[PDB]
């Protein structure tokens, strides 16, 4: 939960190009990287990551006990 992010910052962390897959909840910036639905940052051919997700996830097929796993590394600004 170190590092505070404003909106330009965060679009840099996309999961593409040597960049780690970071995307924004409710204020928080996740760290996805990792996952294997995040691959190259591309989440099922409709989402991407370095952007704020939160409106996003209204459409999810899931509820956001999904983002549980992942760690929080900032804040979006
Ligand atoms: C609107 C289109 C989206 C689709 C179709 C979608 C689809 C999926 C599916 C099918 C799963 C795993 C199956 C399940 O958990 O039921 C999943 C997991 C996940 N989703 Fe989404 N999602 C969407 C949007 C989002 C958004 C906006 C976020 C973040 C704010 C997000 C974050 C995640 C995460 C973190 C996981 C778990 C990944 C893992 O465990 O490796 N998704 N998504």
């Known amino acids: 939960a170190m590092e505070e992010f404003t909106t330009e910052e965060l679009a840099k962390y996309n999961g593409k190009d040597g ?3 970071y ?3 409710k204020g928080k910036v ?5 996952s294997m639905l995040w691959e190259d940052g ?8 370095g952007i704020d997700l939160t409106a ?10 999904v983002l549980e796993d992942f760690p929080v590394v900032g804040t979006l600004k």
Do not use: I
Not at 30 to 34: F, I
Not at 56 to 65: I, L, N
């Open 30 to 34: 996740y760290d996805v990287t990792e």
């Open 19 to 21: 960049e780690k897959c």
């Open 23 to 25: 995307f924004a909840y």
């Open 56 to 65: 996003d996830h209204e459409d999810a097929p899931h509820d956001d006990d």
């Open 42 to 49: 591309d989440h099922q051919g409709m989402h991407e990551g």
